[PDB]
Write an enzyme that holds these catalytic residues in place. Sequence first.
Site, PDB file in Angstrom:
ATOM      1  N   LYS A   1      -5.549 -50.023  73.314  1.00  0.00           N
ATOM      2  CA  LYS A   1      -4.593 -50.465  74.511  1.00  0.00           C
ATOM      3  C   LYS A   1      -5.817 -49.268  75.522  1.00  0.00           C
ATOM      4  CE  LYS A   1      -2.355 -46.279  75.641  1.00  0.00           C
ATOM      5  NZ  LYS A   1      -2.431 -45.741  76.600  1.00  0.00           N
TER       6      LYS A   1
ATOM      7  N   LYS B   1     -11.461 -46.585  72.798  1.00  0.00           N
ATOM      8  CA  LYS B   1     -12.645 -47.892  72.012  1.00  0.00           C
ATOM      9  C   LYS B   1     -13.741 -47.512  72.695  1.00  0.00           C
ATOM     10  CE  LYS B   1     -10.693 -50.791  74.788  1.00  0.00           C
ATOM     11  NZ  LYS B   1      -9.118 -49.617  74.898  1.00  0.00           N
TER      12      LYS B   1
ATOM     13  N   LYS C   1     -13.343 -51.542  83.028  1.00  0.00           N
ATOM     14  CA  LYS C   1     -13.661 -50.239  83.509  1.00  0.00           C
ATOM     15  C   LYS C   1     -15.407 -50.047  83.324  1.00  0.00           C
ATOM     16  CE  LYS C   1     -12.269 -45.445  82.149  1.00  0.00           C
ATOM     17  NZ  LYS C   1     -13.082 -44.798  81.179  1.00  0.00           N
TER      18      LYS C   1
ATOM     19  N   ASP D   1      -5.026 -54.984  76.470  1.00  0.00           N
ATOM     20  CA  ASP D   1      -3.377 -54.983  77.692  1.00  0.00           C
ATOM     21  C   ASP D   1      -3.392 -56.259  77.586  1.00  0.00           C
ATOM     22  OD1 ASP D   1      -4.041 -51.445  77.989  1.00  0.00           O
ATOM     23  OD2 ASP D   1      -5.794 -52.571  79.183  1.00  0.00           O
TER      24      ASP D   1
HETATM   25  N1  LIG Z   1     -11.420 -38.470  68.740  1.00  0.00           N
HETATM   26  C1  LIG Z   1     -11.547 -37.913  69.897  1.00  0.00           C
HETATM   27  N2  LIG Z   1     -11.339 -36.589  70.364  1.00  0.00           N
HETATM   28  C2  LIG Z   1     -10.697 -36.056  71.523  1.00  0.00           C
HETATM   29  N3  LIG Z   1     -11.585 -36.856  72.894  1.00  0.00           N
HETATM   30  C3  LIG Z   1     -11.367 -38.343  72.517  1.00  0.00           C
HETATM   31  C4  LIG Z   1     -12.068 -38.637  70.777  1.00  0.00           C
HETATM   32  N4  LIG Z   1     -11.462 -40.405  71.769  1.00  0.00           N
HETATM   33  C5  LIG Z   1     -11.052 -40.481  72.548  1.00  0.00           C
HETATM   34  N5  LIG Z   1     -11.745 -39.295  73.050  1.00  0.00           N
HETATM   35  C6  LIG Z   1     -11.092 -39.382  75.068  1.00  0.00           C
HETATM   36  O1  LIG Z   1     -10.670 -40.230  75.241  1.00  0.00           O
HETATM   37  C7  LIG Z   1     -10.506 -40.402  76.472  1.00  0.00           C
HETATM   38  C8  LIG Z   1     -10.476 -42.383  76.051  1.00  0.00           C
HETATM   39  O2  LIG Z   1     -11.330 -42.100  75.687  1.00  0.00           O
HETATM   40  P1  LIG Z   1     -12.356 -43.813  76.087  1.00  0.00           P
HETATM   41  O3  LIG Z   1     -13.090 -44.372  75.412  1.00  0.00           O
HETATM   42  O4  LIG Z   1     -12.648 -43.871  77.654  1.00  0.00           O
HETATM   43  O5  LIG Z   1     -11.476 -45.175  75.887  1.00  0.00           O
HETATM   44  P2  LIG Z   1     -11.135 -46.395  76.418  1.00  0.00           P
HETATM   45  O6  LIG Z   1     -11.621 -46.950  75.753  1.00  0.00           O
HETATM   46  O7  LIG Z   1      -9.769 -47.120  74.515  1.00  0.00           O
HETATM   47  O8  LIG Z   1      -9.859 -46.460  77.734  1.00  0.00           O
HETATM   48  C9  LIG Z   1     -11.371 -39.712  77.109  1.00  0.00           C
HETATM   49  O9  LIG Z   1     -11.243 -39.013  77.373  1.00  0.00           O
HETATM   50  C10 LIG Z   1     -12.661 -39.130  75.261  1.00  0.00           C
HETATM   51  O10 LIG Z   1     -13.572 -38.711  75.677  1.00  0.00           O
HETATM   52 MG   LIG Z   2     -13.345 -48.177  77.493  1.00  0.00          MG
END
Ligand SMILES: Nc1ncnc2c1ncn2[C@@H]1O[C@H](COP(=O)(O)OP(=O)(O)O)[C@@H](O)[C@H]1O
Ligand SMILES: [Mg+2]
Lengths: 280, 279
Positions: A9, A14, A41, A128
Amino acid sequence: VRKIAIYGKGGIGKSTTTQNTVAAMAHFHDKKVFIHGCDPKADSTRLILHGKQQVTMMDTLREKGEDECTPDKVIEVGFGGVKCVESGGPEPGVGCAGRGVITAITLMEQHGVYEDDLDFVFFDVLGDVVCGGFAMPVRDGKADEIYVVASGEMMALYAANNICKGMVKYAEQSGVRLGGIICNSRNVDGELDLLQEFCDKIGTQLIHFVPRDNIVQKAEFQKKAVVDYDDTCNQALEYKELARKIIENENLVIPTPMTMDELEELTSKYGFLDGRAIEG
Amino acid sequence: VRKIAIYGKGGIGKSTTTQNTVAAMAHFHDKKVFIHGCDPKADSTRLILHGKQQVTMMDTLREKGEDECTPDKVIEVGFGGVKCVESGGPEPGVGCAGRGVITAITLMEQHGVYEDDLDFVFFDVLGDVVCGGFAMPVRDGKADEIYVVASGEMMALYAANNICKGMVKYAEQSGVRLGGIICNSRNVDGELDLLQEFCDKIGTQLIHFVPRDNIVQKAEFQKKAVVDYDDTCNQALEYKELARKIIENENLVIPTPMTMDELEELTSKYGFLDGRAIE
Ligand SMILES: Nc1ncnc2c1ncn2[C@@H]1O[C@H](COP(=O)(O)OP(=O)(O)O)[C@@H](O)[C@H]1O
Ligand SMILES: [Mg+2]
Ligand SMILES: Nc1ncnc2c1ncn2[C@@H]1O[C@H](COP(=O)(O)OP(=O)(O)O)[C@@H](O)[C@H]1O
Ligand code: SF4
Ligand SMILES: [Ca+2]
Ligand SMILES: [Mg+2]
């Protein structure tokens, strides 16, 4: 080459898990790796590329033309020698959100990019919805293995279960298999136990528990993946282990999805009546 | 009739906010309302229908046929006289996830359903992508007003910002306007102030702050909306006020989206560094 698609999600982690796991494969395990961003994104490569907002393949097609759109104009190299591409896509409402992923993978495939001296290709895919270009890795066999980043959130389980549904339908013909679920911790009690149980019901493994560590944001503030920022910190070694497990993974299955009722029962069991799973 | 689309990222609280707000409109404000579920998860109406799992129109079309897939067989009435339908969607990977929404809204329009003795139509719409059927209330003029449910989560603001982008491209021709952001509290300090400034940046209003209240799950266990479960509790009154604010709303705008970097700057400003808004 092993082609790996990462689902989950939105906001689940990811791109964090992909970039840091890939960074670890290149830095700790001497692997040659390629990230293909497959999320509108379009920030799936920014940390490997130290902040650079990569021109998308769709933007290059628009500005430069079909006659001039080649892989060398859309691939950038960053940390650890990791090669990066961003698919891009239509703006909101203009057209199919996943159209850019289709055009980008096709061009990459036509020119053998994935086959050019690589150990691993990682697709960072929006999960999603499972349609259009976002379903190519499951439906059309563009990926060999799939890992899903999840948490205790209902929509995170829902997203994972929907990719499993897509696999029941197409995996025997496409060859894609499920390598496991990654728990990207939100520091909420019971998330690991829940996802371990989820993995057992659908017939896969919980491959790794990635802890919540605000070093992730410290490195982000410096335009770096954790492994780039400090390769000796705990979180970097957590990604070193997750990378080792993927490299060494032989557990690859066609999963058995759960019903929605089963999903509600599982979240209620662990105190997540409020699907958002804010407190365990 | 006022046609309202409700957007926001998955799990933000679209179906909860919609069903409870609509229940408040019918119960407190004597409004005749229709809920059209436009989310493949297809549980946007079970609380109004006291737990009933609705047959989706796409499932009906598949088993009955177009000559027989009439609104009489898919529309159901529940609490407060609210009429409900679910569009449905294809199974994952089989086809366009928003295809059911296109067919559903088309059928409802061609049969005059939205014009049949109704004050409001609410579309509960998946917003993680803005395309196919999910883009119809923005691009094709099938909604008059939009409200986005959001929170301090980065992806919640991102989803709201993508609706803004779709409106900059199409709202002048389609006639749709943004009525405001609804903050569905995650009980995270600073969420209200972050969304307030976000609304100021894009040119809209933060129309209401819905508290997090576990009475929602208590009513859910009873298969009821909060207003139906207990119309005197504080959360029922919160939805009573949100309903009033929407009925009376005349601040309808075409917004200005923020760029990705502005959004990251904004969330960091308010301490929302980890975009998952959990602490
Ligand atoms: N293990 C973790 N510890 C701390 N923050 C995390 C962790 N994994 C993801 N994040 C944070 O959570 C948010 C979502 O991460 P993101 O990789 O961009 O999600 P997605 O790619 O699935 O949309 C970001 O702000 C990232 O810094
Ligand atoms: Mg992403
Ligand atoms: N104001 C609230 N207080 C408590 N729980 C809420 C509130 N709003 C939503 N929830 C809970 O959050 C979860 C997601 O709500 P939901 O309406 O299904 O989101 P969406 O429709 O956007 O996917 C549900 O478990 C619901 O009970
Ligand atoms: S196939 Fe999927 S990504 Fe494409 S328009 Fe339909 S819902 Fe959107
Ligand atoms: Ca209009
Ligand atoms: Mg919903």
